[PDB]
Amino acid sequence: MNIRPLHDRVIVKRKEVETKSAGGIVLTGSAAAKSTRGEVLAVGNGRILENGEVKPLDVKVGDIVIFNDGYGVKSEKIDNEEVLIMSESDILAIVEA
Template sequence: MNLKPLGDRVVIKKVEVEEKTKSGIVLPSSAKEEPQMAEVLAVGNGIINDEKKKDEIKVGDKVIFSKYAGTEVKIDNEELTILKLSDILAIVE
């Protein structure tokens, strides 16, 4: 897979959510929420070439993003999301 985002966009892959609650109840797929945490797979040149933005995010970062942000695509049987840098709310350290 070679997907290169344009401008100030970022490619992310959502991190799977736990299948059980803390009390041990297994959740069916229909009851699970869409994950809002993801790993950054690629960063656009608009971010890399910008002196202010280039240190904000990098490939491999775990991020939290807006619930309805981005465009979902399926490439090589992988579900990825392309979104703008402004849709990323936080980096998880």
């Protein structure tokens, strides 16, 4: 089953746990840390707040995004795939070109 985020919510999948190369040629052994990068899979309508209909989100299904692994970030299991659910507020930027 593919998921369906409920307006304002984004579904992302984390990338690589410190892709072993930080700095350049040196393979950083797992130094107790996680990944802040991730890919979009599904996107809700928009934020309801202010009454005024619902403004759509600025993230299209499939961007490579940097987010803040804050408190509002939850962890989930779909078809057996490691996924995350947070609001746009927790997303900080995009990695374009």
